[PDB]
Amino acid sequence: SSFSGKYQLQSQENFEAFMKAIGLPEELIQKGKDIKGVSEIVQNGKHFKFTITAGSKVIQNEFTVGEECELETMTGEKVKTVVQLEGDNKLVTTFKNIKSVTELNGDIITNTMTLGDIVFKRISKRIGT
Ligand SMILES: CCCCCCCCCCCCCCCC(=O)O
Ligand SMILES: CCCCCCCCCCCCCCCC(=O)O
């Protein structure tokens, strides 16, 4: 149950640069750079549900830690990958050559995606039940 909670974005580094490189239609790139998105995570042991909302674009995802699962990326592209726990508080996966780390520390979820040399980094905070 550790990741569960509702979280809102506070600040991000390199949003625009990273969203370009991944075939994000520019309309969303500009409308998106400023949205403090909300993440809903529901964890039950290995099983994860998470929903990322950024006004009207709702991406909902589910995975089992350790299993190969379909994930829906930024662009809407669905990609087969495995998500891994590396300790109770850290989700690590790799898709379309992006290395993604999600990390809980207290009420703070830090997510970091790197495409070759670009480090897109989102920091979020818990907002209630
Ligand atoms: C203006 C209305 C539509 C809103 C469009 C928002 C598009 C957002 C684009 C990228 C946001 C997704 C963030 C990645 C998810 C994550 O960090 O795990
Ligand atoms: C749309 C991006 C795809 C998501 C691929 C990462 C899968 C595991 C990590 C997601 C768990 C919830 C963390 C989101 C927190 C945040 O928005 O920064």
User: What fraction of residues sit in β-strands?
Assistant: over 45%
State the order of secondary-structure elements, H for helix, E for strand.
Answer: EHHEEEEEEEEEE
Q: Count helical runs.
A: 2
- Helical residues, percent: 10-25%
CATH 4th-level superfamily: Calycin beta-barrel core domain
CATH architecture: Beta Barrel
- Which strand order do you get reading across the main beta sheet? 4-3-2-1-11-10-9-8-7
- In the CATH hierarchy, the third-tier topology is known as Lipocalin
Listed once per kind, the bound small molecules are: palmitic acid
What is the terminal-to-terminal distance? Answer: 13 Å
Shape: globular
The CATH class designation is: Mainly Beta
How many E-type strands? 11
Main pleated sheet: 9 strands, antiparallel
Specify Rg, calculated over alpha carbons: 14 Å
Can you tell me the number of structural domains?
Answer: 1
Structural class: mainly beta
Structure commentary:
By secondary structure, this protein is mainly beta. It has one domain (1-129): Lipocalin, CATH 2.40.128. It is built from two helices and eleven strands; from the N terminus they run βααββββββββββ. The strands form two sheets. It has a nine-stranded antiparallel sheet. A two-stranded antiparallel ribbon has the order 5-6. The two termini are 13 Å apart. The relative contact order is 0.22. It is classed as lipid binding protein. Keywords: lfabp, Palmitic acid.
